[PDB]
Structures are given as structure tokens and as C-alpha cells.
């Protein structure tokens, strides 16, 4: 099916306590593959997935040189923004940047992204046409005008449509075992008495990949959305994800409830019942 490549960059100023912290991570779909941490001892981009460990030194030296170049532009940006917002030099502030690309199920370029946030809120973003910019803040207007004059969108469009997608395809092929796989959820239910007249039925999906999954309860086939407690999908630590959904069932009514599970790794959607 469809695939994406995304790089996430966070820079946090630390007034007095030295240079800002800078952390970069890269993902293909829901699998992390590289990281760089300004505070770690290597000072290099490092592997986080088995399939990338095989790219050679030209790859690691080049990504380390470019990730360091990003670190430094964010260091300048923290100063440029303090200025644009006339803020104090004593406070910690955060700059975040994400960019990347999506290819459809034919593996052709589908969408590109390039956007920044300052202290948790949207600052500027490249539009879908990859030719124009969205800036909400009056402060952000200076950045937009500068980028237009310097034709920054043309350079990024080139990268998002060519380099970005070409390398996602290469990763998909090289890590086919990890990336082009699907791990179906292993399911079960639990039953626990809340009172003498109600019980909580919890529907569990464990060990699945990718993260996208739909878990729902129905009572006599009617969706119980407002009455289902759902937790956020969470990582197990081994590359798979977990999630649960629970409902409170009045005495004698266990047979009325069904838990439904949709996930790309399943041959067909599951319908489970406590019985």
C-alpha cells in the first residue's frame, strides 16, 4: 500500500546552561530508522533500525554533516525568533520542524511537507502546491517574505518530488522484511466485576504493525462510541503496538456485546464475543 518518510527536529534553548538541545529523528511509516542528539557523545547520525545499518560510511558521514547543518540553522533561528517576538533572553523556547513525503500505493510521489512550529504553535508551513506559504503570525510574515524573495519553495519542491521519494523507495526495498510486513493483532478479552450488577469487558489487540487500527464495541450491532473507553495506541517497545477498548456490561448482558477489530494484517475483520 501507501508509504511515507518523515524527519522530526526539535531545538530547545537553555539560557545560561549552554548551547540549545537539538534532537533529530527519521521515520519510514511507523518505524524509526535514525537519530541525532546534540547531547550524546557520538556527535553523529546513528542507526535505529536493522536495515539501515548497512548503508556505508558515505551515507553516515553525509547525513551527519547535513544533520549538524540543520542543528546550526536552528541555533540561529532561536535567536532570530526571540528577536521577532521581542522576548527575553532568559526564557527557554522551542523550535520544531518536520518535512518529508508520501507515495501512494503505486509508489509515486503523492504529497510533500515542510513546516515549523515555535513554542508549540504553527509558525509557517509550505502549502500543498509546494509553491506558496501559510504564515499566521504577523511576526511570521518576515519569514514568509524572505523565503519568497529567495525562492526557498522552489528548492524544497525539487527535493520533495525527487530525492525524498527516490530514497523512500530505496529504504522500502532494502528493509522489505521490516517495512513491507504486516503483524496482525493477537486479541483477547478480560472480564472483571465492578459491582454485583455491572462488569467491565475489555477488548485487547496486541503485537500489531503498522499502528493504524480500529477497535470498537457494538451492543446488538449498534456502535457504542460514546460509551467505550479507548486508550491511545501505544508502543510495546519491540516495534509493535497495543491498544484496548472497554465497555461496562449490566448483569446477564455479556452476550449482547461484540468487539470489532480492523487492521491491515487481518485476512478479514474480527468480531469477538465474551462466551
Amino acid at each position: 500500500g501507501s508509504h511515507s518518510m518523515r524527519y522530526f527536529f526539535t531545538s530547545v534553548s537553555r539560557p545560561g546552561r549552554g548551547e540549545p538541545r537539538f534532537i533529530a529523528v527519521g521515520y519510514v511509516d511507523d518505524t524509526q530508522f535514525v537519530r541525532f542528539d546534540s547531547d550524546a557523545a557520538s556527535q553523529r547520525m546513528e542507526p535505529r533500525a536493522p536495515w539501515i545499518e548497512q548503508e556505508g560510511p558515505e551515507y553516515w558521514d553525509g547525513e551527519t554533516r547535513k544533520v549538524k547543518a540543520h542543528s546550526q540553522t536552528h541555533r540561529v533561528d532561536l535567536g532570530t525568533l526571540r528577536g521577532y517576538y521581542n522576548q527575553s533572553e532568559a526564557g527557554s523556547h522551542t523550535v520544531q520542524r518536520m518535512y518529508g513525503c508520501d507515495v501512494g500505493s503505486d509508489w509515486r510521489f503523492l504529497r510533500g511537507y515542510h513546516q515549523y512550529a515555535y513554542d508549540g504553535k504553527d509558525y509557517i508551513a509550505l502549502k500543498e502546491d509546494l509553491r506558496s506559504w501559510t504564515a499566521a503570525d504577523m511576526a511570521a510574515q518576515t519569514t514568509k517574505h524572505k523565503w519568497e524573495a529567495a525562492h526557498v519553495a522552489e528548492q524544497l519542491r525539487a527535493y520533495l518530488e525527487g530525492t525524498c521519494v527516490e530514497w523512500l523507495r530505496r529504504y522500502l526495498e532494502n528493509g522489505k522484511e521490516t517495512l513491507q510486513r504486516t503483524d496482525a493483532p493477537k486479541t483477547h478479552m478480560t472480564h472483571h466485576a465492578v459491582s454485583d450488577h455491572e462488569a467491565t469487558l475489555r477488548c485487547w489487540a496486541l503485537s500489531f504493525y503498522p499502528a493504524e487500527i480500529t477497535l470498537t464495541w457494538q451492543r446488538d450491532g449498534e456502535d457504542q462510541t460514546q460509551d467505550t473507553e479507548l486508550v491511545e495506541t501505544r508502543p510495546a517497545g519491540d516495534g509493535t503496538f497495543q491498544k484496548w477498548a472497554a465497555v461496562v456490561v449490566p448483569s446477564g448482558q455479556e452476550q449482547r456485546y461484540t468487539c470489532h477489530v480492523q487492521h491491515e494484517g487481518l485476512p478479514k475483520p474480527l468480531t469477538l464475543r465474551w462466551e
Binding site: 547543518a69 540553522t73 540561529v76 532570530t80 519569514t143 524544497l156 527535493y159 530525492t163 530514497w167
Partner: peptide, 9 residues
């Protein structure tokens, strides 16, 4: 692979 051109706000 990362974008290789500098960008400053």
C-alpha cells in the same frame, strides 16, 4: 536522506 540546503527563518 535529508534535504541538503540551509534554510533560516
Amino acid at each position: 536522506l535529508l534535504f541538503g540546503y540551509p534554510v533560516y527563518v
